[PDB]
Amino acid sequence: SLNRPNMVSVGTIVWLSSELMFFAGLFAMYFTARAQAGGAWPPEPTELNLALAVPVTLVLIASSFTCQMGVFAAERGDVFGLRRWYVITFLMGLFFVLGQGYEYIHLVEHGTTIPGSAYGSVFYLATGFHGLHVIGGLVAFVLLLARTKMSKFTPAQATAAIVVSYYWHFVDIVWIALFATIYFVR
Amino acid sequence: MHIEARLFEILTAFFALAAVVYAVLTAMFATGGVEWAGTTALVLTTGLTLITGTFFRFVARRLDTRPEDYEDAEISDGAGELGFFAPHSWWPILISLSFSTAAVGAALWLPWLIAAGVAFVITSVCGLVFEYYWGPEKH
Amino acid sequence: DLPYGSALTSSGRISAVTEPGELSVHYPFPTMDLVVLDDALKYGSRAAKARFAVYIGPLGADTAATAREILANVPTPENAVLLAVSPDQRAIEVVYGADVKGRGIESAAPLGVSAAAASFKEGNLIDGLISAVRVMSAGVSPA
Amino acid sequence: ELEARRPFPERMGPKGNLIYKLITTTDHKLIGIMYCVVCFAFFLVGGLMALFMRTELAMPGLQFLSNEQFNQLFTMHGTVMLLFYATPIVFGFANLVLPLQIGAPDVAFPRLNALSFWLFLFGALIAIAGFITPGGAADFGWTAYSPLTDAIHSPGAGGDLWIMGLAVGGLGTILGGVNMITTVVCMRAPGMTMFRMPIFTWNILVTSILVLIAFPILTAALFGLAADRHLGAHIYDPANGGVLLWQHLFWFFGHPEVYIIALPFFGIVSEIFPVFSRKPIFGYTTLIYATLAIAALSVAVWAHHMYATGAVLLPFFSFMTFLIAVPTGIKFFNWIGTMWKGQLTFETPMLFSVGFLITFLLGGLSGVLLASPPLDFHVTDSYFVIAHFHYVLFGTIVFATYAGIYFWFPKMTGRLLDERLGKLHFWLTFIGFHTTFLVQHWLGDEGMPRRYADYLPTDGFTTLNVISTVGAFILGVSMLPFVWNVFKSWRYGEPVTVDDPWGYGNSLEWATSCPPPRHNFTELPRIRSERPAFELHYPHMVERMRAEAHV
Amino acid sequence: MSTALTHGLIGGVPLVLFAVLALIFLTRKGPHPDTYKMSDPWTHAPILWAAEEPREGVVIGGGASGKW
Ligand code: HEA
Ligand code: HEA
């Protein structure tokens, strides 16, 4: 029987709740800069494309499923299923990062930079900090997959997998808020 | 564990009320607009407590009463097996030093120092996480 | 469990209390003198490999053999030397275990007794004690 | 019946007894001790800066100091003695006794607990290291207003080290907060329910919850400012509405910060009062509600720190600031009711805990006046607000801290601090404190603004400045007896061996030895009430305790 | 005003206050009991001090005696 709370999970939950207030600053800056826009909020050089941000968002929304499948495999004692699903998750995350980088290059070429405008500052700051969190998540995947083959698959390793999944479900839920508030509510 | 769950939603109710009051009272008879800076903070302060409250509620519904949650409980009930705690480790100081190096690099804008700091941070975190999992040497 | 604010715990240990601003040791000697005697005992136990002990209290009606049944209370009673002094009745006794035999104690114990008696001509209860311990510890060989 | 003991206990350990188990340590007790030592080491440096800026401000004209030096000096004093001394001492007190109070053998995530300490120390060092540069440290106040802090108006390197040091230091606080929440929630003894743990634990729990809100937004703001200074972004541009973005973001942090360093020191005195009064705590249930109410209120109260602008909704913040002053009154009344009709004895802890009451009341009374915008219209950025926050800070951070130190020194060390050498300390620190801060109300009212390096002879205020300087040097010499006492009463001093040097002890840490073993406990009593050590000792009174409680 | 008076007063008062408060408190008697004289009856409980070195019915042999 199980009759205790997992404290490795409560620790990560409270930390993830605290980390939500970090993005509060970025959201505040965005909404403050948007207010003093006057006319068109995205200025003349800025042209947002939905031809690249939509597929990337869909990929970042398909990673959670695979991640949860890996977690489901973890709870049974399956060490191989976890590895397969986590590798797929890693690849999808890498796709997200490369897509975002490509969009950055495209935007910079047409004259939307950090020192160029007030829009550019907030846009790049918010999306760059999110990218940094994603890279941290990828590093976590690599570290966990490296640890899964050091020793026998004990419940502690399953707990580690579950908490890493928690973290991932926090990088893709904060990107559906940003995508909704940037590309739709302009 | 109901007291823990209640302590968070008690705050959640107040935070939601404060955010809603602030947003409306600023829209009318307040110079400018809706005061996006203060409104943004409170609507995420509520979320901070909401996440923890919901998680605690689910955990409390999952598991039954513990010796800690029992009024007339005996010391003999909790006897058994706690779990694992690290006796000693010298990795934390290395992690702190790595982060300090990265910070000093970022302060004076020395990209090489930043790169070195990031490499050190990754190595130190790897050392910390792979501490009680390394197997014996193979020879 | 007898004194005020004492209780017998589930492990058999005692937990006592003191009044705010009171002491719990209350020896009638200065702290620095206690430090000197402590380090003297500590460094005399080394270099001789036999632990030294000191007794201050009543020696009842025998003053020669009641200082012998109390040697059994010190840790490792064999390979241990004890100096018992009686303030009420002028008496010095030296008692040593069967593991100290032939290590130089026989020719040392009179010297320690003499040092203690000589220093007891004044109110130097603790000064003579340290002198006696120092003289006795310097005669016993580790072997 | 008759055991063998040592004439005096051992003074110190042998060679190589401390050094290695100082960098690899995992024990929470040792971490708390290190907190305390480093915090006091920083306190002395901060006090030296205050002495420097107080000496120059006794006579008109720049005698030995400069404008730049004075600016950097008050910027660094208020930073060091607020973020490098005050915040970490909270976690110092939390690491000493909280696991003992809850009946746990350890905290959750101990390696994280050590990582927090090291983050603290190195962040503090990198922030202070701004004095090594030829330019100097930060010279723009601890508040860091815009656009004074951009690269145009503050192009120094000290100001960047300031930001980066604060950012490094802030991570340890959050890690400590999550650690304390987890420890309280999970690590409890059988029969220790939520409503049976001491008030100190409740205060630390709610303080950690408040930390989890306050600090991340400050980190975000610091990152934004670094982005502006190093990448040439437009975040806090005045044309962009960024002069007041910074103020909102900063004061969302700033006021919860000043409540982070209040509640734990409420809990310390709330623990000390019942012991020396031979009487239980008064209104146990209502105290936790007061704590919860003030903690909840201290989030929607942030703009009372910016009235002199023209861009806040005055009624909202004024009303909330008025409301945040009720449960503090409840706490005061509960303390007075705890002391009422008891057997009072004034040892060193009790003396400091009483001094706290006298100081904090006037501090809070002055604080309530500032909450009305008409009154703050004349008195903001003057020497009256300085008097306010010094009275209100010096009660919780000095008197309560010293009370806790005198209380828990024997518990943690096994030695007793001297008494005739602590009364001198208290009286010096009490006489020398009012002499240096009481006349600043008049200074602020008469038209002396804050952060002034110089004044003219024909200004009127010179005598009121001499008095403050006289008083400040008594606050400098008051530290000598305390440091001497701690240094001399560590190797020597009266052995305890009684595991309760005060008697009538209430909490669970007084049910173990002085000092406690590695794993804190060798046995546990039965938890039935919130006074387990008073249940264990004096069983005869148990029935009385259940009969006289309600009136 | 009167730099001699200012400097001679911001640095003189603390020392006098310290001296007075050190006369008041540090001249009192503490809780440490008075020394035992070898001219009064021994009233304290028995002592039996011992050492802790070497670390970790009884067969014995030998003795001595004394007098003062
Ligand atoms: C948090 C708690 C705290 C503490 C403990 C103190 C301590 C003191 N403070 Fe204050 N102070 C603040 C909180 C505190 N302060 C804050 C939040 C600010 C805002 C900053 C800003 O303006 O930006 C401030 C700023 C401030 C000013 C503003 C100056 C101006 O604007 O013009 C003044 C003016 O007199 C003042 C006075 C004092 C005095 C006389 C002490 C005395 O109690 C200190 C004397 C104590 C000592 C301990 C002296 C020690 C020295 C030795 C014994 C020498 C040896 C040392 C070495 C060898 C290293 N402080
Ligand atoms: C550090 C601890 C601390 C605490 C506890 C407080 C507590 C309070 N503070 Fe704050 N405050 C600071 C630290 C603190 N503060 C600092 C550091 C600054 C300056 C920052 C800077 O700008 O540099 C500051 C500045 C500050 C300002 C801005 C002033 C200005 O910049 O001009 C205001 C304005 O509203 C304020 C109000 C209050 C109020 C109403 C309380 C209340 O918490 C106190 C209430 C207490 C009581 C009321 C007494 C007890 C009550 C009773 C006995 C019942 C009596 C009932 C009635 C009177 C009705 N303080």
Ligand SMILES: CC(C)=CCC/C(C)=C/CC/C(C)=C/CC/C(C)=C/CC/C(C)=C/CC/C(C)=C\CC/C(C)=C/CC/C(C)=C/CC/C(C)=C/CC1=C(C)C(=O)c2ccccc2C1=O
């Ligand atoms: C005798 C003498 C000259 C000594 C001077 C000593 C001295 C006063 C040093 C100050 C150094 C610093 C960091 C100054 C800033 C103030 C400050 C923060 C002080 C330290 C504070 C402190 C104790 C905090 C905690 C410690 C901590 C967290 C770490 C400190 C940061 C560290 C470790 C940095 C220092 C490392 C250092 C000095 C290395 C320089 C060595 C070399 C050869 C660098 C030169 C160099 C250059 C110049 C390149 O351009 C370059 C480009 C691409 C690749 C490489 C390099 C490269 O190596």
Ligand SMILES: CCCCCCCCCCCCCC(=O)O[C@H](COC(=O)CCCCCCCCCCC)COP(=O)(O)O
């Ligand atoms: C200081 C923290 C800020 C972090 C925000 C992350 C930025 C995301 C990168 C987006 C690229 C856009 C560049 C652009 O259009 O302008 C470019 C300049 O931007 C940069 O140089 C970005 C470098 C930022 C450093 C990366 C992170 C720092 C590491 C610190 C770790 C502690 C070109 O502009 P320009 O040609 O001058 O008009």
Ligand SMILES: [Ca+2]
């Ligand atoms: Ca002057």
Ligand SMILES: [Cu+2]
């Ligand atoms: Cu305030």
Ligand SMILES: [Mg+2]
């Ligand atoms: Mg102002």
